[PDB]
Amino acid sequence: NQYIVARPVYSTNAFEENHKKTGRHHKTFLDHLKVCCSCSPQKAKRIVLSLFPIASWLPAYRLKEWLLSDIVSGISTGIVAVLQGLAFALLVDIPPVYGLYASFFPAIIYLFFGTSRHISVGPFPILSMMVGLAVSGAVSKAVPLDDERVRVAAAASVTVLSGIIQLAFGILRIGFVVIYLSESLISGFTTAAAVHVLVSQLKFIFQLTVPSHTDPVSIFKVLYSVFSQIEKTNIADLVTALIVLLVVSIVKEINQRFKDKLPVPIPIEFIMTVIAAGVSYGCDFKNRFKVAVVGDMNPGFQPPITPDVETFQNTVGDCFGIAMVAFAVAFSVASVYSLKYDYPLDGNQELIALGLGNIVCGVFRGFAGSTALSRSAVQESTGGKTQIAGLIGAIIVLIVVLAIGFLLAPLQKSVLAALALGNLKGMLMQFAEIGRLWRKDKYDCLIWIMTFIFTIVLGLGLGLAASVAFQLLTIVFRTQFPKCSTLANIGRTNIYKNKKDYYDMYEPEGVKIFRCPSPIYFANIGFFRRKLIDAVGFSPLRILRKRNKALRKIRKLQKQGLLQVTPKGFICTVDTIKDSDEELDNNQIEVLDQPINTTDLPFHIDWNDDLPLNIEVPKISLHSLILDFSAVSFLDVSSVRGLKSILQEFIRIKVDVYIVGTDDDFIEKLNRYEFFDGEVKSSIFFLTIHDAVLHILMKKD
Amino acid sequence: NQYIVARPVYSTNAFEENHKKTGRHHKTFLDHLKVCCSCSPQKAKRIVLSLFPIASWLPAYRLKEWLLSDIVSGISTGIVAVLQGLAFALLVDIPPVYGLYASFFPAIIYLFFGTSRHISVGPFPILSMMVGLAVSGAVSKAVPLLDDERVRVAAAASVTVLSGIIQLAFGILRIGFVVIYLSESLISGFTTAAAVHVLVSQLKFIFQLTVPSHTDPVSIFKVLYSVFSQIEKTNIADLVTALIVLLVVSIVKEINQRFKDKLPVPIPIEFIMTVIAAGVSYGCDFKNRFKVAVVGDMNPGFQPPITPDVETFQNTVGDCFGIAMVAFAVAFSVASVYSLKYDYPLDGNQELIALGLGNIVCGVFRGFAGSTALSRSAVQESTGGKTQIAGLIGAIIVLIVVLAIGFLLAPLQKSVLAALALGNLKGMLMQFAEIGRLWRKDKYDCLIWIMTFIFTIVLGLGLGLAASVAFQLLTIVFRTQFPKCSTLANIGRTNIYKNKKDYYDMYEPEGVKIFRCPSPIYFANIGFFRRKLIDAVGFSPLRILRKRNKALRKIRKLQKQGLLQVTPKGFICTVDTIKDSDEELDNNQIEVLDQPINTTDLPFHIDWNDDLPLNIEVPKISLHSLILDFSAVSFLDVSSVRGLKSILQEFIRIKVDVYIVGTDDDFIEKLNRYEFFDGEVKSSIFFLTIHDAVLHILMKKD
Ligand SMILES: CCCCCCCC/C=C\CCCCCCCC(=O)O[C@@H](COC(=O)CCCCCCCCCCCCCCC)COP(=O)([O-])OCC[N+](C)(C)C
Ligand SMILES: CCCCCCCC/C=C\CCCCCCCC(=O)O[C@@H](COC(=O)CCCCCCCCCCCCCCC)COP(=O)([O-])OCC[N+](C)(C)C
Ligand SMILES: CCCCCCCC/C=C\CCCCCCCC(=O)O[C@@H](COC(=O)CCCCCCCCCCCCCCC)COP(=O)([O-])OCC[N+](C)(C)C
Ligand SMILES: CCCCCCCCCCCCCCCCCCOC[C@@H](O)COP(=O)(O)OCC[N+](C)(C)C
Ligand SMILES: CCCCCCCCCCCCCCCCCCOC[C@@H](O)COP(=O)(O)OCC[N+](C)(C)C
Ligand SMILES: CCCCCCCCCCCCCCCCCCOC[C@@H](O)COP(=O)(O)OCC[N+](C)(C)C
Ligand SMILES: CCCCCCCCCCCCCCCCCCOC[C@@H](O)COP(=O)(O)OCC[N+](C)(C)C
Ligand SMILES: CCCCCCCCCCCCCCCCCCOC[C@@H](O)COP(=O)(O)OCC[N+](C)(C)C
Ligand SMILES: CCCCCCCCCCCCCCCCCCOC[C@@H](O)COP(=O)(O)OCC[N+](C)(C)C
Ligand SMILES: CCCCCCCCCCCCCCCCCCOC[C@@H](O)COP(=O)(O)OCC[N+](C)(C)C
Ligand SMILES: CCCCCCCCCCCCCCCCCCOC[C@@H](O)COP(=O)(O)OCC[N+](C)(C)C
Ligand SMILES: CCCCCCCCCCCCCCCCCCOC[C@@H](O)COP(=O)(O)OCC[N+](C)(C)C
Ligand SMILES: CC(C)CCC[C@@H](C)[C@H]1CC[C@H]2[C@@H]3CC=C4C[C@@H](O)CC[C@]4(C)[C@H]3CC[C@]12C
Ligand SMILES: CC(C)CCC[C@@H](C)[C@H]1CC[C@H]2[C@@H]3CC=C4C[C@@H](O)CC[C@]4(C)[C@H]3CC[C@]12C
Ligand SMILES: CCCCCCCCCCCCCC
Ligand SMILES: CCCCCCCCCCCCCC
Ligand SMILES: CCCCCCCCCCCC
Ligand SMILES: CCCCCCCCCCCC
Ligand SMILES: CCCCCCCCCC
Ligand SMILES: CCCCCCCCCC
Ligand SMILES: CCCCCCCCCC
Ligand SMILES: CCCCCCCCCC
Ligand SMILES: CCCCCCCCCC
Ligand SMILES: O=C([O-])C(=O)[O-]
Ligand SMILES: O=C([O-])C(=O)[O-]
């Protein structure tokens, strides 16, 4: 092997002048606007099909290979969705038939406007908790069965606003907001929310009466209310909830272990609820043990409702937090299946489909939902091929809402709470990410730990905003104090490494190579300046000021006649200089930062050589400063200004500055900042460190 | 002038093997915590000298060179500080003697604990506005005319004590570097919007109207309405006097800045205008003749110490934090200009400590928060300020005014004080020109400017700043969100690789792709990176693996059926035109298609880019080597390493070699901590440069 290269030394300007650069016209916003309004016939066809995805996938349905599958996954998931809807309507503190409404309308709208083929659309625990908190706040902030009616009305208006926000984000094509939530953040938020839900199910396991607490620290208020009244716990409910929680857990593991052997996952939720409903009815637990039951539900749908502006005004922030969490979750679950089954997934259409589904749901008295991973995993694991299975789940929910709902009358709320608690093992086990992130990346461990605390203390909605803000702040933490280094040549070749990391390294005399391994901007520009000064060994502005002082003294001593100018040196007729400094005042002291123009003097002054009449100036050995900008991705206004100041000061003390390792786009953007001028020129940019070093060597020889 | 190189090709590992690495110790947190508790004699002496800077700059005082200049500068800045304190006590909506207390106490404390030698310590308009808004909130949220102003004075003192406590705590924990979280354009937009706030807040004194104590959000509009809803009750004497003063001061301030050389000292115009205003207001009895609002009679002397209301503390925590952050940012900014202009070191943590102690003492003695005004620090410095003895002399004049000659400021109108404030406001108002400039240079900083302005005008000055800082952190993500990822090519049959779309006569080695992302890769852009890499190579590595696994499954089923035979020559098909019967894997078995293809059981290797027998079809790829130019990739977070590991494993399972080049030794060290390397992904994929990887590939292929 041999890396053999023989090319001329290239400055960025020289390379461009020797290589024809394809002239490429950048696409200005103006043009982008035109193609946007093309109105091509084909274009329109694409748009409409994109907004009504059912017109594409339905006509291509493989009946022989998907119908039976879709049917089975649909009946199974719908059976899960009925119970999940009842439980999550308990989480919202409204009658439970509204949970059935919530499990029927978004699935039906997403069947038409949705792009996922596997996600089960409906409520999930975190969003039901967020919606409940919003309604409790709205009822508190209102200028004046009734309580149930008021809560139900508020749950609908929050949902419509949440959906409108979702619909708006999808129309404006902002479907990329999901990138602003990292893996460590979502993890901490979701385990904190699982702890929230665990705490929220305690009033149903024990059957206690807990107020509608609101954030901050809502979880602790609930815990106090529960354990303060812990002695009133209904044992039958608890034993039941504990029995239901225990059994389902074991069966679920079996389903995850013997999955390959299992033809179909064992439906433990349906079986347990049926047995629970049966034994409660046969033994009349409601009277025998005073257990809390779901009760009788109205056999039908409710008439449409009008969104209340007052609720909208009092819950706008909560609805935003709700829309963002719903989109983050649904997209997240859908993405897993899209990468698993190789089909494209459009976020904008998702927001539109999730927005419209929520509007129809809030209009028809339901509450916000997107998807529950548990129910979706149940849909995908049971043979879900397309959104037809979802249509069958919504059909099962319909059947429950109109004809057989009366069977869910003797079912206890502790059983629903026990199921909702059983679905928490996946999110609760995410506490193991703390140690992993500690080992790998402590900024992401900080993101996780902080999100957990914020979510627990400030709540689901506010905890998330503070968490995203802190997540953005860690980016600054990572780049705030870059490990800048001085480089040196190792091997007498074109390899320049850290000077402190190897032996037998070589630094060309008078030359300094400095590397900042990060983008330079407002938060680290001062640090870059400090580290560059520590690396070169002096402050260029201080050297310039002392040189200007020395030149002022030379001019004062020579025009008085004590120092005669000669083209050979600084001969002095009298060597009786007395100690005296000018002591410039506040108004005049800035004359010491100006460039040294000694053209007035016949002979050049070697500032690094001894001066006449014992004038002392700090002598510098640096003549060439190379800045390795290879990992400097961007600059901002603050940093370009700091950079220019630094360079100007080094140039004014006659230190040639070279910037190497930058691409052509970097020099392109710097031109827009008006960085270059008479003093700082584009000839300071070279291709690599070695190019600059060879240029320096030939200049100096 | 030739770049001539003749060295061996180097993977990062071969370079570490050939060149012995200098062993360096671990900078452990425990041993660092060991140096923390030094208890050394000199260390104790330098710690105490730092916490008490006066013990180091006072003995080193140059009398014959500094004393008279400091005396003159102190006289001037104290005469300015009296009037500025009165005006800012107007801004806080308390009696005007508390502005004198705010101009006295922090200066005397900063004389002892301050590191700056040129800033004038005291209140400035933005902080007086913030303190007044915090005071209104405290009074509004307080659980149930002089008693109204007494409540406001107590709430101001308490807000000040809490602001000083927060500053002193931030200086004790050594967090004096938070000023870096405010960019030049954030500060520019904030100070322009705040100058607009201060302009609107002085209108109730120019016109002499009764405006309620509006609180944010949109207090500037609530206030604009209150003023113009009653613009018919405007006092004409107040407006005329305020106008004339503003005109004169503006002209002289210009005369001052321009003719700096001919004037030995700047013309004191604030002072002269105040004396003339008070004289023509007392002689002509403007108070009775035109019914103008005057400063009134002030209580001669200081007030006894007060105890901070914990209730006010509870109701103003957020406000006090904001008052503390804005105060530190302004003071540090003002002080920095002069540290740099005069070459002396400026400790930021001692700045926080001194400002916090000054605010605590001021609030205890019935003052309001203040850190420094750029206008008054300018007067002290331009009049010859050399040390903080000028601040001591300014505080002595404020003391003289408080105790002895405060009654002279009795007939002075408040419109004159408002006019002085506006004359000082023009400098910050002139920052609207930065909009167009930033638009041309950096639209992200233009966005920071405009959004900071809008957040500060619409929302409060405290919520506005918090919202503004958050959006400025978000623009950092905006920059590194959609990087201009590109494909490189060789240019000049040498070691120069540039954008494939930029020059003519470039050269792509057959089968090699070189991909460059010019940004750090993290959670917000790992998806965009994966998408652009897939667009660059021309295919999806995963789709290929699944199709090959699908094909291999069909090949294997056929073999189990005797329909074809496998021999060292290849696949022998006695039966051709096989029935097409796709397997249709289910949802729980489909994952088998992402597994590495293990065909070792088969006697011969399968050329997946050749023709497969019996109508089997797989996409063919020309790529056999992928170079990733990670030179400008600064950092990698956990999300990015996961996405990265994922992408690389897929390329490797489809037998495409992957190379990461251009990275430094710290970058690779960190990746080892992420558990990135393993049996499939090895540290051999790392090469020093692109040419090294390319040469290594040419050598492999040939
Ligand atoms: C491209 C990015 C898109 C951003 C879109 C942002 C949209 C922002 C636009 C509008 C929203 C903010 C103002 C409220 C709505 C305007 C109408 C209004 O008058 O406000 C009313 C309700 O307003 C409130 O009480 C809630 C205050 C805002 C909380 C939400 C902000 C954080 C969530 C957002 C997260 C942002 C990040 C989004 C990412 C998830 C109050 O005003 P009023 O009723 O006239 O008052 C009269 C007296 N009254 C009060 C008694 C009635
Ligand atoms: C309101 C209610 C909230 C309650 C929350 C309670 C949650 C916590 C409760 C239980 C968590 C229990 C699981 C811990 C990890 C188990 C798995 C693991 O191996 O991790 C390992 C590392 O150590 C860790 O990862 C855990 C570190 C502590 C995390 C919990 C507290 C911090 C929560 C955030 C702060 C909140 C408070 C912040 C303010 C102080 C420990 O396993 P091992 O066997 O020892 O190691 C074997 C070797 N191995 C590591 C290589 C494998
Ligand atoms: C509550 C009270 C708030 C009131 C606020 C009012 C503030 C604004 C009032 C007055 C501003 C007047 C100064 C403008 C600039 C002058 C200097 C300049 O040369 O700039 C130039 C560029 O153009 C600009 O820089 C200005 C663009 C508009 C900015 C003002 C509105 C945006 C404020 C934020 C949005 C707020 C609302 C957002 C929602 C809609 C114009 O100069 P020129 O001579 O034309 O150009 C010559 C060539 N040259 C450019 C190379 C030199
Ligand atoms: C991207 C921009 C935002 C999103 C798009 C714009 C917003 C779209 C969604 C708008 C809101 C949703 C549609 C409208 C909802 C309200 C729709 C309101 O209509 C309700 C009635 O139909 C109810 O009928 P009733 O008979 O029950 O009437 C009750 C009163 N009486 C008659 C009984 C006394
Ligand atoms: C998975 C989705 C469906 C889940 C259903 C619940 C789980 C199945 C097991 C339910 C509990 C066991 C069976 C039911 C026991 C209690 C059974 C309670 O009986 C209700 C009584 O009124 C008698 O039944 P009727 O048919 O007279 O009632 C008519 C009611 N309407 C039609 C007039 C309104
Ligand atoms: C497979 C579906 C779920 C699992 C099967 C269903 C659950 C089976 C377990 C039933 C619960 C266990 C039996 C009941 C336990 C509590 C046993 C409760 O007994 C209370 C009675 O002594 C008096 O009734 P009161 O309602 O007046 O309550 C007064 C309570 N003291 C003061 C007398 C104690
Ligand atoms: C490419 C440039 C433009 C990109 C689009 C614009 C920027 C999009 C990204 C924005 C950040 C990421 C999305 C948001 C994530 C966090 C989304 C956080 O949601 C906020 C809610 O949690 C707030 O709930 P609160 O209860 O605190 O509301 C209180 C409201 N009052 C009471 C104060 C009025
Ligand atoms: C970094 C950690 C935080 C910062 C350090 C810790 C906090 C330091 C600052 C603590 C607060 C400031 C010092 C204490 C202030 C309150 C100091 C309270 O004392 C006030 C009395 O001296 C007033 O005397 P009077 O005679 O007027 O008494 C009034 C009541 N009678 C007697 C007339 C009826
Ligand atoms: C900036 C620092 C000094 C600025 C001073 C302001 C400039 C002077 C111009 C003021 C206008 C005209 C002159 C003053 C008119 C109001 C002057 C009002 O005088 C009060 C009258 O009783 C006569 O004055 P006395 O000498 O009796 O006052 C003694 C008051 N104590 C000591 C008993 C309490
Ligand atoms: C450098 C020194 C400062 C600058 C120079 C000093 C400023 C000189 C300005 C002198 C006063 C300027 C204008 C005043 C014009 C209003 C002229 C109004 O005069 C009002 C009086 O006749 C009656 O007293 P009132 O206070 O009740 O006012 C009633 C007002 N109306 C109903 C009769 C109209
Ligand atoms: C290098 C690693 C260690 C880093 C050290 C710690 C990092 C510190 C940096 C923090 C972020 C940037 C600094 C912040 C500057 C902006 C400073 C922002 O000020 C916040 C206040 O304005 C909040 O005012 P509010 O109106 O919200 O208060 C009202 C309270 N209630 C009524 C709502 C309850
Ligand atoms: C306006 C006062 C009466 C209305 C009060 C109620 C409304 C308050 C807000 C009104 C608008 C704000 C006040 C007016 C602000 C506009 C003031 C806008 O000024 C911008 C120009 O000065 C900038 O152009 P220059 O050529 O000066 O360039 C900058 C200077 N160098 C750097 C080139 C030398
Ligand atoms: C804040 C985090 C980081 C650590 C401290 C958590 C604190 C705030 C938690 C732990 C225990 C909690 C308290 C537990 C009991 C009560 C009584 C009841 O009226 C509800 C609120 C209240 C008063 C809680 C307030 C919040 C609380 C004090
Ligand atoms: C929000 C930013 C981005 C643009 C819109 C600014 C809006 C909110 C501004 C412009 C004009 C302002 C209004 C002007 C007049 C009044 C009447 C008075 O009762 C004070 C508030 C109120 C009602 C203001 C509310 C805020 C306001 C409406
Ligand atoms: C009444 C409770 C208000 C709670 C406010 C919490 C504010 C948290 C700010 C966190 C700043 C760090 C970056 C997000
Ligand atoms: C009572 C009205 C409160 C309004 C609060 C609005 C908060 C807006 C925050 C925007 C933050 C943007 C970060 C990128
Ligand atoms: C926050 C966890 C503890 C909540 C309170 C538990 C019960 C404490 C005693 C209550 C007596 C009324
Ligand atoms: C939005 C700023 C101006 C608000 C209105 C000012 C007063 C206009 C006349 C009001 C008459 C009642
Ligand atoms: C699922 C089994 C339901 C059994 C119900 C028995 C009712 C008996 C009533 C006397
Ligand atoms: C009302 C609170 C709004 C919080 C928005 C947080 C956005 C963070 C962006 C980094
Ligand atoms: C009460 C609002 C406080 C929010 C502080 C935000 C700090 C900005 C950095 C994310
Ligand atoms: C060895 C030097 C010790 C210096 C101690 C200073 C103590 C100051 C207390 C105010
Ligand atoms: C600064 C000039 C003050 C003149 C005061 C005149 C007072 C006259 C009272 C009759
Ligand atoms: O919220 C949840 O736990 C879910 O999505 O299943
Ligand atoms: O607030 C101001 O304008 C100042 O500091 O001068």
Side-chain angles (χ1 to χ4, degrees), chain B residues 330-374:
Chain B
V330 162
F332 198 69
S333 299
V334 174
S336 300
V337 168
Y338 298 118
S339 308
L340 187 66
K341 168 171 188 205
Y342 293 102
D343 199 7
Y344 58 93
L346 196 94
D347 200 3
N349 312 296
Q350 195 60 29
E351 287 315 281
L352 273 164
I353 287 174
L355 296 178
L357 287 173
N359 282 357
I360 290 165
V361 181
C362 201
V364 167
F365 288 93
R366 320 261 187 100
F368 53 95
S371 80
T372 189
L374 174 57

Side-chain angles (χ1 to χ4, degrees), chain A residues 213 216-225 453-454 456-458:
Chain A
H213 295 303
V217 296
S218 166
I219 193 171
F220 293 99
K221 305 170 180 174
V222 172
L223 281 170
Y224 176 85
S225 303
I453 298 172
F454 287 143
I456 295 297
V457 176
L458 307 175

Side-chain angles (χ1 to χ4, degrees), chain A residues 3 5 7 22 24 62 65 180 339-342 380 441 480 494 501-502 586 641 664 673, chain B residues 3 5 7 22 24 177 181 184 381 386 442 481 495 502-503 543 546 584 587 642 665 674:
Chain A
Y3 179 116
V5 172
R7 61 172 177 89
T22 296
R24 324 148 55 192
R62 316 171 55 189
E65 300 75 11
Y180 299 119
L339 178 70
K340 174 175 185 175
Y341 299 96
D342 188 27
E380 179 258 333
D441 201 8
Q480 180 175 350
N494 51 341
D501 295 11
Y502 298 91
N586 293 16
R641 292 173 181 175
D664 303 328
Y673 286 96
Chain B
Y3 178 111
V5 167
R7 63 166 173 86
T22 292
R24 292 159 52 198
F177 59 78
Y181 298 122
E184 297 179 349
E381 178 274 337
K386 297 289 189 289
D442 187 335
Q481 208 186 194
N495 52 358
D502 272 8
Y503 304 80
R543 195 159 307 161
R546 294 175 173 181
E584 293 177 350
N587 294 37
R642 279 167 187 161
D665 269 334
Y674 283 101

Side-chain angles (χ1 to χ4, degrees), chain B residues 606-648:
Chain B
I606 295 181
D607 203 35
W608 287 111
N609 309 129
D610 200 89
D611 276 287
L612 298 193
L614 297 199
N615 223 7
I616 307 170
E617 314 297 349
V618 196
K620 312 174 183 177
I621 58 169
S622 310
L623 188 68
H624 58 66
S625 283
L626 172 81
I627 296 175
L628 298 168
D629 179 31
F630 265 35
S631 84
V633 172
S634 293
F635 55 85
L636 249 61
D637 72 358
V638 301
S639 305
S640 57
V641 302
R642 279 167 187 161
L644 177 63
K645 178 67 169 297
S646 186
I647 310 172
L648 272 42

